[PDB]
Design a protein around this nucleic acid. Structure first.
Lengths: 90, 184, 110, 183, 380, 195
RNA sequence: UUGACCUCGGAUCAGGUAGGAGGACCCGCUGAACUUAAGCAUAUCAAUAAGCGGAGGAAAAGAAACCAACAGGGAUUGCCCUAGUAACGGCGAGUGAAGCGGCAACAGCUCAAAUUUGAAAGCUGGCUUCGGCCCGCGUUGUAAUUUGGAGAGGAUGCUUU
RNA sequence: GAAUCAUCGAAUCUUUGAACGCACAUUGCGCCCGCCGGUAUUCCGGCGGGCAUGCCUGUUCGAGCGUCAUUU
């Protein structure tokens, strides 16, 4: 009826199968340097994947959509240096 | 679970049946048949799930409760009245000699001490009736075909016939022969 | 080319050649084993046998007591004065079915 | 009229209902194989205007192809690549046409209309016996489909001077040194 | 030098078990049984069941490999598949509610409930089974016995009343042939019933008919195999009767009239046209059958032995000689009861029986009613 | 543990997706199907007007041919076919519209309830393109239209029209401009809380 | 319990299909370097050579989202001319068309977009006495009509098979 | 009616090879249908018909709480 049991079985099988088997810094740089403002940020945030249901959907389908919903934005060597320095630990 | 369509349909069936029964009761029980008594075999068919008290008592007298029951009967005044009363549930008509012979031979059961034993033995037949003038199953057959004074006793002794359900095979004078080979 | 129309009543009321038209002898293959024929009816089966065949009442009671299929003969003789006294046999259809199952369920050995 | 309404949907394909349908169908296509058989098209209006017929011998095949760069760009379109893969898959059929049906962040999805040349209904139909003829073997491989013509620049005008009659043939014609008898 | 396995070779090659045979033939158990009985296959016994199959039991039955190969190469396999697809189609129609298309589907089906004839065509297999009309006459023993059983028996789901009626007509036609050709030779009656022995083309044919009573069917009996046997012997008797009437010149099938049959003519219903010791027994005799006597056996034997005129009671049947006992024409009357016209002679069915068997006119004084009957003898 | 077949797993996953996802109003009103009594009465009338099958059509053609060898009115029958029915609705020749709820290209239908609403013809959505294809003598049909019937059933046609346009139309008209879904189960609730 | 509809599969089931070869000419993909610039790197060589895929007797192209500014032309294709002009260019080396005009040949069409709706009129297979009987496809659309220098529908009166 | 004749519409056409039951460097090894001979219902040997893949149409079979119902 509610499908909870079948969803439980599907998620358990997906977990068993799993067990068996720069862009952000670029945007931060564009916001910091006087290049893109708040309105431009929301304008660019209105993408083809806007209003993507993420809470009521099964974990496996959400993982597939997260794998295949990545838009390619230009990156910069300054952003690469920044992310390398951020990831460099003690 | 049962539904309002069935409630309404059953109530209208009961109402119309009551109206028709009152119609016959008020009208004179005179059928368009000669005053001579006849022989008619009657087989009952499930027409209505619920039956009024008068047809129920008539069917009780005619012992036609279990499915696909038939029996021979005298066509007289009172019997014709009862048949006209129970008309929707019964289908009746003149039997054939071959029809009655085949019916008795293929499906024949004797009633003794409230038990239904097959008409295997003329010895059993005579231990049952014996002194009334019957001498065998063929004697019962001839009595039924040409009614005698012992017809009531013979009808009481013979168990009501249970015809096999056909797969597709009012009053009619003769087609009961086709129907009896159909259910036999 | 097209048959003119005929209604279903006509179609309903509307709805042999010799087997050995060309017959030649055929040798019987050795592999085939014909089923043995049933024995002819004996003197014992008769409804009105000579008094010698009549069994004792005690033997009749013992036969009735014995369980079915445990007897050498399925029948014991009985004497009837008239044919109308003779009753139909109970296991005629059962014997028919048993011999059919013997024909088509029991192996045949030469 | 229903095909006209479907055409309007395909025009406003970015709307809510069409976006939902393409989302669900994209999930289904990812779950299925790279190449698979459709008896009925996903966009019947587009299939009909491209030439799909409700006949024994017409099939649709749905194919997913990797998208992106090959900074050298692969001059053959993803549509042509899908048609060619369909050709190697079922070399028996003839590629009638192809149309985009869906797209993702990694794969682009096409549906190809294919015709059976050995079925006598297709042989009888005088509108398709042309592709029954042997000249149309591997049109996708020779670039004879719509994507092939678009990539070959088979259009009229001064904008297509070098390719209206064949690029290589035009090159050869312009670079032949013709010498007559009476020079 | 080649190494060769024991199991793959020998009796395992020659014989196959029932389960292996049904798995190879690819049919369900009832259809497999029907086809095996149709082709006449019997299991037989191998010399070494362990050698046939190391894993075997005495209860297990084996089958002939060549016989299974024939079963594969019978076209009734294809007819089986087509018919099964046809019940699939009629179920299609019934589920969809297409009453008319369902009617045409059952028309194509030609089901043996309305049909009364075999659902399938068995002419080729009966031809293969019986190379000779002599073999047909040899199997006529079981054929006639079993069909007369079915003429007596009532109808069930597996055996329709129409097909029982056709079996009754076939039995009546065979009886008409017997009475025409005087082929009947010996009659014995016992508690089981009446055994008839008739000589046709030098072949003795035996068949047993039970008495006219309500026969109980209590117990575990299967009508489906029994109904298949019905179809067997019905088709076989039809073909044999056609052949016999062609041999004697009388047209086939003989015409029978429905109104007289319904009133109860029985044997008298059929009309036979010749062109398209036995007789001297009762060559010139007039016989009457009383109400108690067995009408069908008595008339059958009298007509088979040439008694010209037999009459009986009106309730017994229709299409007879004068029913009135006061008629002086009746030389002999068969009465078995616990009139007294001086001209008529009162005799018994046992008198007729022994007179027919001995062919020496056994004394009616010895066989008079009201006295203890001397024991009879079995001609066999 | 045990492993399920690929297509079975995919098919169950698709039903889970349809019942989980937030549904646009068109597919939502597709989800909202009518009741058993209305379906049964409509099926009764539609069966009394089911189209002639091929056997009896050829039979009546042969009837007419033999009559020519050795007088009618316009046939009233249920009209079937997506394009035919949408044109009939556009021309306002349709009296009642029945729509299959399971057209596997769903775009074939998305606009049909709305066009019926604006045109004015009463419409309903029934379960089973299979039942549509059995009402007609086919395997499947997308839409079924009743345009005009004979005299004897004017009354029951009008009564069925009123019954549907009140008791299904208003009932699913109060709530059809929203988005469906939201059928999260216990594990879904716990997963969302943990997320 | 039963029977559909849809989807996905198996069968040494029935009927067919694809390989490879050849590749002078043809249609696409992919794609160098030597050399020249008296050195060389852009360029050139060359949208070539090698490699890959695909047909035929020809292939390809083809009936304008064209040319043009005309007093207009009028599918495509090949020759002459336009012309070493325009145009582009380490403005060096160099690269390099097209309209028009004279010719050769010349042929126009099929669809999707409509409701046959007073009648799926269409088609596949096997079974044949070869004449007509079924099964299936299909309304999520097969016949007829129609394709924008058009057409449909009525009325109308001529003329064709 | 000759020919190392011409034409050529009819046949035979060994093993391989796109190479196709598996193997291939063995005249080896397999499974289904039928036959033949030698003690032969069993044993042996041989012979004939067959058994690749992807796809299309049709036939048949199977699976799926995907899904529809079915009290008149």
């Amino acid at each position: 009826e509610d499908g909870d049991q079948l969803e439980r079985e599907l998620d358990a099988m997906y977990e068993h199968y799993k067990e068996r088997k720069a862009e952000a810094m670029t945007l931060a740089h564009q916001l910091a340097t006087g290049e893109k403002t708040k309105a431009d940020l929301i304008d660019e945030g209105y993408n083809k994947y806007a209003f993507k249901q993420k809470e009521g959907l099964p974990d496996w389908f959400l993982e597939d959509e997260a794998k295949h919903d990545k838009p390619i934005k230009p990156i910069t060597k300054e952003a690469a240096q920044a992310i390398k320095e951020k990831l460099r630990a003690l | 679970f049962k539904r309002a369509e069935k409630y309404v349909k059953e109530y209208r069936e009961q109402e119309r049946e009551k109206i028709r029964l009152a119609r016959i009761a008020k009208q004179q029980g005179s059928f368009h048949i000669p005053a001579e008594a006849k022989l008619v075999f009657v087989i009952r068919i499930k027409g209505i799930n619920k039956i009024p008290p008068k047809p129920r008592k008539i069917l009780q007298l005619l012992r036609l409760r279990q499915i696909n029951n038939g029996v021979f009967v005298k066509v007289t005044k009172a019997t014709a009245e009862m048949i006209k009363i129970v008309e929707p549930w019964v289908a009746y008509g003149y039997p054939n000699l071959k029809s009655v012979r085949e019916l008795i031979y293929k499906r024949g059961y004797g009633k003794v001490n409230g038990q239904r034993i097959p008409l295997t033995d003329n010895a059993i037949i005579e231990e049952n009736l014996g002194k009334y003038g019957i001498i065998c199953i063929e004697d019962l057959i001839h009595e039924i075909f040409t009614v005698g004074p012992n017809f009531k006793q013979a009808a009481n002794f013979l168990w009501p016939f249970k015809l096999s359900n056909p797969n597709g095979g009012g009053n009619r004078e003769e087609h009961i022969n086709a129907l009896i080979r159909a259910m036999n | 080319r097209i048959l003119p129309y005929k209604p279903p009543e006509e179609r309903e009321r509307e709805e042999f050649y010799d087997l050995w038209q060309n017959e030649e002898p055929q040798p019987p293959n050795p592999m085939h084993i014909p089923a043995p024929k049933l024995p002819p009816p004996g003197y014992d089966l008769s409804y009105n046998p000579p008094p010698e065949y009549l069994p004792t009442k005690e033997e009749r009671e013992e036969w009735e007591k014995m369980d079915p299929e445990d007897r050498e003969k399925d029948y014991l003789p009985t004497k009837y004065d008239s044919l109308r006294k003779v009753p139909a046999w109970g296991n005629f259809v059962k014997e028919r079915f048993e011999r059919c199952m013997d024909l088509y369920l029991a192996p045949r050995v030469r | 009229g229903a095909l006209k309404y479907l055409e309007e949907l395909s025009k406003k394909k970015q709307s809510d209902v069409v976006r939902f349908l393409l989302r669900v169908r994209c999930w289904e296509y990812r779950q299925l194989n790279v190449i698979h058989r459709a008896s009925r098209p996903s966009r019947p209006d587009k299939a009909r205007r491209l030439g799909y017929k409700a006949k024994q011998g017409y099939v649709i095949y749905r194919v997913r192809v990797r998208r992106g760069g090959r900074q050298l760009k692969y001059q053959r379109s993803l549509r042509a690549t899908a048609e060619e893969r369909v050709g190697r898959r079922c070399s028996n059929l003839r590629v009638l046409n192809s149309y985009w049906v869906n797209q993702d962040s990694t794969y682009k999805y096409y549906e190809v209309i294919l015709v059976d040349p050995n079925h006598k209904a297709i042989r009888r139909d005088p509108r398709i016996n042309w592709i029954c003829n042997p000249v149309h073997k591997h049109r996708e491989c020779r670039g004879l489909t719509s994507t092939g013509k678009k990539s070959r620049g088979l259009n009229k005008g001064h904008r297509f001077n070098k390719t209206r009659a064949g690029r290589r043939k035009t090159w050869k014609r312009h670079n032949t040194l013709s010498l007559w008898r009476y020079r | 030098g080649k190494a060769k396995k024991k199991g793959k070779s020998g009796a395992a090659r020659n014989y196959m078990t029932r389960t292996q045979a049904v798995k190879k033939l690819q049919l369900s158990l009832p259809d497999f049984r029907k086809l095996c009985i149709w082709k006449g296959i019997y299991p037989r016994e191998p010399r070494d069941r362990r050698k046939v199959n190391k894993s075997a039991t005495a209860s297990t039955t084996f089958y002939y490999t060549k016989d299974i190969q024939y079963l594969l190469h019978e076209p009734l396999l294809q007819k089986f598949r087509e018919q099964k697809a046809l019940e699939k189609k009629i179920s299609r129609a019934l589920g969809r509610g297409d009453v008319s298309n369902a009617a045409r589907l059952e028309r194509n089906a030609n089901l043996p409930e309305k049909t009364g004839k075999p659902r399938y065509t068995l002419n080729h297999i009966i031809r293969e089974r019986y190379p000779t009309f002599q073999d047909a006459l040899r199997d006529l023993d079981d054929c006639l016995s079993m069909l007369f059983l079915f003429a007596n028996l009532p109808s069930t789901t597996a055996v329709p009343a129409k097909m029982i009626a056709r079996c009754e007509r076939l039995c009546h036609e065979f009886q008409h042939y017997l009475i025409v050709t005087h082929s009947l030779r010996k009659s014995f009656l016992s508690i089981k019933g009446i055994y008839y022995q008739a000589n046709i083309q030098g072949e003795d044919i035996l068949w047993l008919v039970p008495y006219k009573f309500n026969q109980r069917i209590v117990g575990d009996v299967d009508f489906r195999i029994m109904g298949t046997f019905v179809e067997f012997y019905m088709t076989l008797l039809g073909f044999v009767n056609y052949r016999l009437y062609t041999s004697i010149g009388l047209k086939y099938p003989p015409k029978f009239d429905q109104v007289k049959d319904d009133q109860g003519a029985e044997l008298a219903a059929f009309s036979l046209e010749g062109l398209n010791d036995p007789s001297q027994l009762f060559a010139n005799f007039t016989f009457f059958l009383s109400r108690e006597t067995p009408r069908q056996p008595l008339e059958f034997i009298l007509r088979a032995f040439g008694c010209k005129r037999i009459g009986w009671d009106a309730v017994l049947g229709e299409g007879a000689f004068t029913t009135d006992e006061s008629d002086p024409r009746i030389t002999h009357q068969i009465i078995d009861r616990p009139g007294r016209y001086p001209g008529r002679i009162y005799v018994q069915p046992q008198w007729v029986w022994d007179s027919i068997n001995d062919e020496e006119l056994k004394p009616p004084e010895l066989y008079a009613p009201g006295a203890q009957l001397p024991p009879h003898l079995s001609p066999f | 543990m045990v492993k399920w077949p690929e297509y079975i797993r995919l098919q169950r996953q698709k039903k889970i997706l349809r019942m989980r996802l937030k549904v646009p109003p068109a597919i939502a009103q597709f989800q909202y199907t009518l009741d058993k009594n209305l379906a049964a009465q409509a099926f009764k009338l539609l069966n009394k007007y089911r189209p002639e099958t091929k056997q009896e059509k050829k039979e009546r053609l042969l009837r007419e041919a033999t009559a020519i060898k050795e007088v009618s009115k316009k046939p009233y029958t249920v009209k079937y076919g997506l394009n035919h029915v949408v044109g009939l609705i556009e021309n306002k020749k349709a009296s009642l519209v029945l729509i299959a709820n399971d057209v596997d290209p769903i775009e074939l239908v998305v606009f049909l309830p709305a066009l019926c609403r604006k045109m004015g013809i009463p419409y309903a959505i029934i379960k089973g393109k299979a039942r549509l294809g059995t009402l007609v003598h086919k395997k499947t049909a997308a839409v079924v239209a009743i345009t005009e019937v004979r005299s004897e059933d004017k009354n029951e046609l009008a009564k069925l029209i009123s019954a549907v346009k009140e008791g299904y139309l208003e009932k699913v008209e109060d709530t059809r401009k929203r988005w469906g879904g939201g059928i999260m189960g216990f594990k879904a609730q716990k997963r969302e809380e943990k997320r």
